[PDB]
Amino acid sequence: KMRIILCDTNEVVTNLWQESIPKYLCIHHGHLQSLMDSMRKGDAHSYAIVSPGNSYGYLGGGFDKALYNYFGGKPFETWFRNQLGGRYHTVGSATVVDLQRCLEECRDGIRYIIHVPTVVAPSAPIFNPQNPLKTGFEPVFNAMWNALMHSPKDIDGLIIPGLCTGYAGVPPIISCKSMAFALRLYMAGDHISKELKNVLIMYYLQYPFEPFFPESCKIECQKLGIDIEMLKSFNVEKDAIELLIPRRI
């Protein structure tokens, strides 16, 4: 019942989202303030917002700078980093910060910030055209998966920006595809077993390893209309994610 709210100032990103995403989903072109201003005319709700910044919790750059300004600036950033323990958080981790404490500064119905670091520090882009998978498709998928897996069950909606497309340098076409795959897996719900979802992620990320593909899952693929041969050779740079998750599901 959770609503997914995709928000980005780059029309390139928002257009791609519209084209890739099969109400349950909202796409907003503009800044965070713009999104909050438009949701107010209908907020007459609890939300979590994804902060895909750095390993230290500093809030600068693109989307995070917006959160920085929206929640109170420097004093807020200081409070935020302290909630994160003021220490180094590895890329691939996720930490939920409860803003409820503000009531004890508070701002709208946004109660949680899900900290999902995508870079140690923004000293350079993370993307490298030499290996799009390892530095593009994978990091964006992981950040999206983490955001979804750590989203508090009590929220009405999850606000997410165009992951790693800022200083990080991941091309929007790449970022949006991984974000779409993570969302398709999520929206599939229980229609796909937890184990088959594990297998789909494995092949999507190009880590083909048969021993981790149980017979029960092959049986499920046939039942679901998922072509096992195309799955085993899935190439994210050439194949449609629809092959992995038929819209029928």
Place this chain on the structure above:
Amino acid sequence: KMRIILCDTNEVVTNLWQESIPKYLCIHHGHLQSLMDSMRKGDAHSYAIVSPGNSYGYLGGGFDKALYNYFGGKPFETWFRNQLGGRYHTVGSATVVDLQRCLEECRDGIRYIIHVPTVVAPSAPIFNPQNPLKTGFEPVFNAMWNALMHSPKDIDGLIIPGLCTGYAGVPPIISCKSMAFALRLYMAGDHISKELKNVLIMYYLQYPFEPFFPESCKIECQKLGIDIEMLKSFNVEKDAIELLIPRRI
């Protein structure tokens, strides 16, 4: 007061550990069973063991295969994966599994397994000589940092293998250096502020970003005898970690 127990079957790894590590630390050359057999003559204690495997919790390969055999084989692996929720865990995350449940199968004083995935699946090495930092120094440091940060405070000792040196392919010389840096940071305790440790990690991993290097930390460097210029240009491939953390600390 926690004891660090480094264990590896590769004498190359164990020798390097002895040379790099400044009782509080034990180095064992041999298999896990060998370590447990030798600790018994003195266990007349609670331990956590690091399992640096894959994103799915399967226990195969090197060190994990030893844990697999030690705890009960297939039935144990199945129980283990279920404790992990049976889902995909991103590299960079860490999950503590409590074996205490066995009492409700049980094996020695090992109460916890800290799951620290280092690869999605072992379909190929993670290391690439073209970028030793991103595929060698960084992943090993992150896995060690995660293991240390998630170690239950109630244990007497932490058992850790030669991280990412198996199928992963990280050279022992590289893996041991990052493991030594993480340990030096940890052993420094409160002698180095949490914020300066953040800065040291940043430069060690080669993400030089001045805005994240506060004046208070520069002041602390001078007090501690940490050369700020050598810090700003620290090159893990050429400089000694002693520059970052003088043994005086």
